[PDB]
Structure formats: structure tokens, C-alpha cells
């Protein structure tokens, strides 16, 4: 019981940690993408 349940939960926790790290990565990636969207919109409108 100890070994099976502990390995199950350790793998689940590693899953959760990787998800959280990728979630922060998504935070920053969305930041960059949305700032780029804003800049492209502004520059195209400026050239217009």
C-alpha cells in the first residue's frame, strides 16, 4: 500500500508541478504575443 500509493501520488505531484510551470510559461507567452499583437495593430494603423 505504501509503495503503490506513494508512487501514484509522487507522479501526480510531478504532473501538477509541470503543469504549473507550463502555466507560468503560458502567462508570459500570452503576454508577449498580446503585446506583439498590440504593436502590429498600432504600426499598421500608423502606416495607414
Amino acid at each position: 500500500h505504501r509503495q503503490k500509493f506513494s508512487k501514484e501520488k509522487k507522479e501526480e505531484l510531478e504532473k501538477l508541478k509541470n503543469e504549473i510551470a507550463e502555466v507560468k510559461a503560458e502567462k508570459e507567452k500570452k503576454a508577449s504575443q498580446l503585446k506583439n499583437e498590440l504593436d502590429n495593430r498600432l504600426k499598421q494603423l500608423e502606416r495607414d
Binding site: 505504501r2 500509493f5 506513494s6 501538477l16 502567462k27 503576454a31 498580446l34
Partner: protein, 53 residues
Amino acid sequence: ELYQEIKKLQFDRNQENKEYDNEQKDTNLKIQNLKERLLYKKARAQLKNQYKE
């Protein structure tokens, strides 16, 4: 000799069951807490990115 080892073995069983329950509960709690931390990080990420949008 056999009775004494039986007694020690019984006590080992009792304690080990204690630690089994403890570890099971604790690691389930840790899984829940990791899921909740992922939830909050997703919340901040998505909200900050929405305001970037």
C-alpha cells in the same frame, strides 16, 4: 522466542499502518494543493494575459 518476535511484529504492523494512513492522507493533500496552486497560477496567467489583450 516466537512469541516475542510475534509481539514485535504486531507492533510493527500497528505502527506501519499508522504511517500508511499518514502518508496516504498527506500525499493526497499535497496533490490537492499542487492542483490548487496550478489553478491559481493559471488564474493569474490568464487574467494578466487578458489585460494584455
